[model samples]
Target: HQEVPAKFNFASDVLDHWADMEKAGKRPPSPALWWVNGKGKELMWNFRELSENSQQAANVLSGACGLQRGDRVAVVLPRVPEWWLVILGCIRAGLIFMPGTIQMKSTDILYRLQMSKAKAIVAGDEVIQEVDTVASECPSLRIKLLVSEKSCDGWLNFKKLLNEASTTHHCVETGSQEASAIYFTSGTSGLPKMAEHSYSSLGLKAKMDAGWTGLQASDIMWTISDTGWILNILCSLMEPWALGACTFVHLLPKFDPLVILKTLSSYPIKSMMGAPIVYRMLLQQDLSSYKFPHLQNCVTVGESLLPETLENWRAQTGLDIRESYGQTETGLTCMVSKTMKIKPGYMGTAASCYDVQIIDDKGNVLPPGTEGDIGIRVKPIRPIGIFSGYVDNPDKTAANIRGDFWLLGDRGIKDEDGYFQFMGRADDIINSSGYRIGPSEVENALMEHPAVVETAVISSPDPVRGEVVKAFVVLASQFLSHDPEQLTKELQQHVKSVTAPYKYPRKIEFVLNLPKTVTGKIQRAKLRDKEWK
Candidate 1:
């Protein structure tokens, strides 16, 4: 048996596959990074082009930006060509890539920059001004790199730098366990914490995810998502390229069903992954009008799929909508693949990379058909692709694992056949659309409003979104008799302005009081139950 080397660089390893193939003329004349926008802009890059372009990007980051290995850098671009090259460049330079969404508000961006101490940031012109608004507060932010056709006076132009830089740069290598990237994930309490990833984990994540993705060398995969989140990276770029498959990226200015159906029908896309809401929206369209010639497999990520939704897709497209389950902390733990039969209301068997179990609060394993906290083994041997704990937050990290098992904070059950059922979350972490919104984070924003005397946020049932952030709020005595509808609108906008717009409460119910425990802690689950019931 052989083992991966102690020193690793995932980017360099992926590029090496392309380099060797091209050196011997065995490389196919296909794309490695393929992109198209709805506005009639398409760019295709073969592995060789990606290699040299990323190398030039590496030179720009190391030479012009003056960033060294182990430094933290943020990347906040949409699905643009520069997004891929900059991330590859960060990996090659052995810097931690902190990926954020283009929809992030100024306050959240400020908090992320200050907490992580990221030395440099590469973002699109759309969100550059938002970051610029809080740049002075982030002392560690020295390099404000911008990616767009029009350049700002204070920012460095990414395209100009990469084109002019040398391509003879060297990639930095580090221990496999050394930190490679940082993903900001939220929980039941506090602002989002940084969850770090290692090089081996990144490489292993691709392989384990490919078990379900089932991408091949000649296949072309497309994910109906942007570059903000981790799942998009895995399905759209990482696993596809890791298996030498090409990727199809369509930058939809708006997520129109007609546009999506047209893109799939036009391209040679073999596999497609999307959230449950996308399937529902597509179902609303007269799907019989379109034909996806090359679309063989359609998989669902983000939220669990309703049995009716799956059946509707099968009836309409004659293809089963597959499903997978995982959080930001763990990448691709369980999924339904082509070979496996679909078990409605059940996530597929665990991936070989993880030893998943249904464990009690005491960390004792529960029998099949019993409901408990879903956990992964972390005692005898740690699983690859799991979080390396929250960066600089040991207390939060230690609190996650109990007695050798890393608890996922979700309540679920497993059958004798090895399928996992998602009973609601043990914590009040709402999964709406494709974004995870913590109840505490939402409640905190509500508390900042002068009219809100008390509030409790929880997950509410939503038809399209799967689940939505719903808040039960108590207003101050003076504002209680005011127009409730007007106050609700004001609070919703207030939350949108305070935090990321996605986390704002979609539904609000004015209440006199919220259920509370002896310790005065709000009982979120009670409200959660009422909504679900």
Candidate 2:
């Protein structure tokens, strides 16, 4: 491993490193960025082009918005070229970038902006109305940029400003502890927490070896995940660029198994990473007719990989799905790279950078086969790239760090071979299609409706999605006579309007009363256990 730099700037160190190679004629001819859509549109940019465009974007941020370093800017956009520009531009300008799903509604967006205290917002025109509805509520917001060609009042155009601004901006000199990015992770008892990552930490993660990703200098790697996800930052941006590898993005807004397979065969993509559910869905399609001519490496992130999905994919493609376990707080905890052997139901051993273990409640490392909290050792030399706790929330951060270990709130056991088998999540979180849904978040959304007196949300096993949110509701006295079926639809839509649509409960049950503790707390574990059993 290389020595960590005292002042690590990604845009200067990593992106410029490749751009310099391209300038010196030492780089491959492969495009740094390859974007395609289902509509037969294709666009590509070389390393120099990428760097120049991002530099222009950085100039626009400072010149147009008059923004300074250490400011938080929230970005919610589709998978497009501007997303990458804004990401690199933020790092170059020393701004704290925040990522949000475009699927989030007005209420959800407002919640995030208020919680993160974002000073600027960048989003697509599709959600311009939703943003404006609550933009005034965010007192910290001073700048608004739109990624649309059409004119809009009170919003700066991204492409227009980039063209006008000079592409000669200097990358900000940042120390190890300066905030670079903030990501919101779902919590069991709250909406979301801002998991802050610093420049040095992110650059440290970018310094990771290319062995796990198994990409050559010119190889094109594709990752299928939402723009909002941390996986996209890790796979689509950091890892690929760190190795001077090209990235291929298919702008298929809606997921289609056929489109994915066809696109894989269409492009010369050598490596691919997607959520486990994506692979499970891909298996449903008749894969015998498809072939990935250039595909060599396959990895799954976001959620635990099921053994059946891995087996099915291998049987069809003869490519084992390498499973890597990680969280929003920690980038890459464990990884099964192309060089590692495939275990049936185990995530790979700890990565080279961190000390990961299954620890008992007392912070003692548990023996093999002992189910306990999955933790990262923070004492005795903590890893460089792990998250720098939540923003402005010390209580939650302190609670997660127990003794000398930062508990991941997940339960797992180590095998004799040092591989880890995930037992289950100790917290009440619903993992459906790689989206972590908190029961309390849904409960909070559901409680906002007039018809609901109380509710409890839990995870119910689904054949395809692995788990779906199931809500048990106790209707108010006035709405008790309302049709249960009709009210269910209303409640679902209400939740969708209040939060990200993905967190809406798929199955809602009308119940007389929910199980509760003597002190009046909802016993969500009981509902979850009953549903699973």
Candidate 3:
């Protein structure tokens, strides 16, 4: 059934009513290609069948496990098909679904599960050890829904549970405002906060996301993000489903640039979205062999996509990479709308549906070309897909939102043409002497240097200025010479030439790796926390 504002809850609009699409003369949908492997089998499940299976699982959860509406379930897993099933089940059952990354330790998992008061956890096999380690600490964890062939002694196997349950079930009538999912921000800039989103919010990916990315039903979209990450939940599943597109999801144990290129060549991937790192890593591949004829749109989000990386992607694909902009609080907002004269540094225009503007510290909206906090104005009533508040923290909820606007913590500047260019997070922006140095500008400049591969720029303490630009870099394979110190010096000068002379990294640290979250976002705050000269 096509969505109406009043009937926008995921269960009513999508899941329960999906089977009735045929009655309205809609063509029976091609089942989503569940390109899954592991448990010694590669399987494909139709979206129609998956919809029914999730209802059956929700019935099992309601009947067998004693789960009810609004009860929370913590999900800690990799990019598995069952992760989607359990998530859908949670929505169908009217349960609060909390997602956790596999990178989180036993203690971190337990803390979130307890903090959210999660009744059960639909965990992956990889995190079975972590669950066992912290089982005693988390008293509230009643049921352990493990989604692997490998079974622990005490935990419930999801495979076996599904086998025991009946597939015939009905979706309950939940209100539009029901909690569909709770996403904990990766917190690269600061402490993690659980952002609440409704089923309507979940479904907006179909409309707004589709409109923003130009994602159509006929397209095959590939967003190379993990299921555990917040963006994946938004774009990969909800958005793709709304448009009825074929989403390409690969469960790689580790990212290999060559394997990725091979996968792109193998699959009918029309549009692909990724972070700067994905594009940066993909650039390393010897791509002379493959011909990507079907691939058209390439989008980048999370941190700012480097101009060098964007141009390189265009050179490789013969298509300009459309840079997107969004945050945890708001859904997709400003995007470098497709087929425009994309400024290398700008985030392009605001999504036509939402009112995006830059504002100063006191909440006064800035002029067209002023640098300030990025705030999205929620005109009269809040927009669909915008967050419902911080899950449990009222203070944080109030702190983020002022009157009718949501303050996205990122610092950005708007040009006269209404294009927004991201500077850095307010905390990451370095005030060196008199000049205001944006960390992204410095990091972007560093990325252009041949010696640097990936870099994290943050504010380091200084005696003369309040803070100075400090750069931590991961050098390329060619630059990993016997004397990295000499290479580091060259890289420092490379940054000076690319951007501004003052924006040059005063303190440069060459390292084998930088600290990244589970979702592959660099943890810039960690660098800021360090007492480096």
Candidate 2 per-residue C-alpha lDDT over 162-184 given as tens digits, one digit per residue, 9 for 90 to 100: 99988788999987778899999
Cα misplacement distance, residue 292 of candidate 3 (Å): 1.4
RMSD of 2: 1.7
Q: Candidate 2 at residue 251, lDDT? A: 79
Report residue 158 deviation for candidate 1 (angstroms). Answer: 0.6
Model 1 lDDT, residue 431, Cα: 86
- Each prediction's whole-model lDDT (CA): 0.84, 0.86, 0.71
- lDDT per residue as tens, model 3, 390-481: 87788877877765678887888888888899876656655453333556667777888777789988777654333577888887888666
TM-score computed on alpha carbons, candidate 3: 0.78
In candidate 2, position 134 carries an lDDT of 95
Better of 1 and 3 by lDDT: 1
RMSD of each: 1.8, 1.7, 10.1
Native-structure RMSD, model 3: 10.1
lDDT of 1 by residue, 1-533 (tens): 11346787767777557655865689765588889998788999888778888888888998999899999998988878888888888888888889998888788899899999999999887687789889999988889898989989899998999999987668887777888889898888778889888877776567556636666888888887757677766677687878777888887867798888888778889988888888888888878787886688888888878888988988888888888888878877788878888988887888778889999879999999999999888886787777678999999989998888888888899999888998878887888888887778888899999999999998888766678889899989999788989999999999998888888998999999999999998898788888986
What TM-score goes with each of the models? 0.97, 0.97, 0.78
Clashing pairs in 3: 31-46, 31-47
Clashing residue pairs in all predictions, respectively, total: 0, 0, 2
Winner of 1 and 3 under TM-score: 1
